[PDB]
Design a protein around this nucleic acid. Structure first.
Ligand SMILES: Nc1ccn([C@H]2C[C@H](O)[C@@H](COP(=O)(O)OP(=O)(O)OP(=O)(O)O)O2)c(=O)n1
Ligand SMILES: [Ca+2]
Ligand SMILES: [Ca+2]
Length: 423
DNA sequence: TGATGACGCT
DNA sequence: AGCGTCAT
């Protein structure tokens, strides 16, 4: 009826860097540019663990979480860049700093929510209203949308041909007369995101993709539809067809046990199928919150706000100790707690200088031969010896060894600074 | 054979 | 508070 909310109130984008760590390394080392290449951590174990892959290497079947020695079997000419190691562990500072470059650029356009090291949500509703005012109600030219795909359109034989036919159908259909058409608002949003992505590339060298829609889940889904170096507009109207063959697990938060249970309990495969169930039925199976969430989401509606948050809320350091490397002496545990604590102290001091805040809680987490114990103590001083001494103090009792020895051995250590306050 | 980070439940 | 889920 005239009172059925359609979840078209906002314009939300999700901007995600293409093969991010790989681009960081390629910018640094021009010999890696436009080549099959990957970023690896820890060279000794099977050439190291692949944690990022260029699109060129992806064409050979190289993936994340593959051992480099194995990746080389698929791609003999694969080039590799190694993650920095400091104090005996992988150190991700280069990637965090590149991340800050990008986030700082996006923050000029609109308030952002840092969703991860290489992606951010953007609420463009106000920016769109304003840009709609700045225009004299002039039509939107395709030239303003050079890398934009309109999902579901068109309805030639080469990719760019298709892209342009879809875009032309979209723009030809557009009611630029009313400033309150959600489709018009999304289109202006897409123009702004073209501008943002251009500024990111110009000012960092980094390419990215984006999704533009009415909420975060649709924006995120849209982003991945046409990668790399392209952006995708998913309109409200596109949702029934898009979801009609969209596996449940592709939607953010449904990739795990809950999505599996949706599939198993309801006996469905695709997002669209969820529409067959009453809100009450879905709530009965998956709980009040999840139920309402699913009922709205399968109709393309979601209300989770883009949160005004550009900085991580926690600062952490962890190290696994697999197999025979598991820690078995107290001196070992103490030494590694110290390495972790020294990295953490460096990052915390930098953080306090840049961001005018101080962490107040230290979380210590271990695994014994995914977390054997998690204990918190006060963080009152940015001092590595104190933090590691305190960590030790709070995991001390875990040692079942009556004997200078640690039993069972520890296969993971984790230090996390949390509960920031202004300073 | 990894290193992170946000948020939900009780 | 501690533990779990989901994700990059
Ligand atoms: N399990 C993972 C996933 C990602 N990353 C790091 C390396 C990635 O380069 C960066 C961003 O991850 P994405 O999942 O966005 O993947 P990419 O940016 O590498 O590729 P795409 O272009 O597919 O987004 O985070 C990681 O360390 N461990
Ligand atoms: Ca990415
Ligand atoms: Ca990402």
């Amino acid at each position: 009826g005239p009172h059925m909310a359609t979840g078209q109130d906002r314009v939300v984008a999700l901007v995600d860097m293409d093969c991010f760590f790989v681009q960081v390394e390629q910018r640094q080392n021009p010999h890696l540019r436009n080549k099959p290449c990957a970023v690896v951590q820890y060279k000794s174990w099977k050439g190291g663990g692949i944690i990022a892959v260029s699109y060129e290497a992806r064409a050979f079947g190289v993936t994340m979480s593959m051992w480099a020695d194995d990746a080389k079997k698929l791609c003999p000419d694969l080039l590799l860049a190694q993650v920095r190691e400091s104090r005996g562990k992988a150190n991700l500072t280069k990637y965090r700093e590149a991340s800050v470059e990008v986030m700082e650029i996006m923050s000029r356009f609109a308030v952002i929510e840092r969703a991860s090291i290489d992606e951010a949500y953007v609420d463009l509703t106000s920016a769109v209203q304003e840009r709609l005012q700045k225009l004299q109600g002039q039509p939107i030219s395709a030239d303003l949308l050079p890398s934009t795909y309109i999902e579901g359109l068109p309805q030639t034989v080469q990719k760019e041909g298709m892209r342009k036919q879809g875009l032309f159908q979209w723009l030809d259909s557009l009611q630029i007369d009313n400033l309150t058409s959600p489709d018009l608002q999304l289109t202006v949003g897409a123009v702004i995101v073209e501008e943002m992505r251009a500024a990111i590339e110009r000012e960092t060298g980094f390419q990215c993709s984006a999704g533009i829609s009415h909420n975060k889940v649709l924006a995120k889904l849209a982003c991945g539809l046409n990668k790399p170096n392209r952006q995708t507009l998913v309109s409200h109207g596109s949702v029934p067809q898009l979801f009609s063959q969209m596996p449940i697990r592709k939607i953010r938060s449904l990739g795990g046990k809950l999505g599996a249970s949706v599939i198993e309990i309801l006996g469905i495969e695709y997002m669209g199928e969820l529409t067959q169930f009453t809100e009450s039925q879905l709530q009965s199976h998956f709980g009040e919150k999840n139920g309402s969430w699913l009922y709205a989401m399968c109709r393309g509606i979601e209300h989770d706000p883009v949160k005004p948050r550009q900085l991580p809320k926690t600062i952490g350091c962890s190290k696994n100790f697999p197999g025979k490397t598991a820690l078995a002496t107290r001196e070992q545990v103490q030494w590694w707690l110290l390495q972790l604590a020294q990295e953490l102290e460096e990052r915390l001091t930098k953080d306090r200088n840049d961001n005018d805040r101080v962490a107040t809680q230290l979380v210590v987490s271990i695994r014994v031969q995914l977390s054997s114990l998690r204990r918190c103590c006060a963080l009152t001083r940015y001092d590595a010896h104190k933090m590691s001494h305190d960590a030790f103090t709070v995991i001390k009792n875990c040692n079942t060894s009556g004997i200078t020895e640690w039993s069972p051995p520890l296969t993971m250590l984790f230090l996390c600074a949390t509960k920031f306050s202004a300073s």
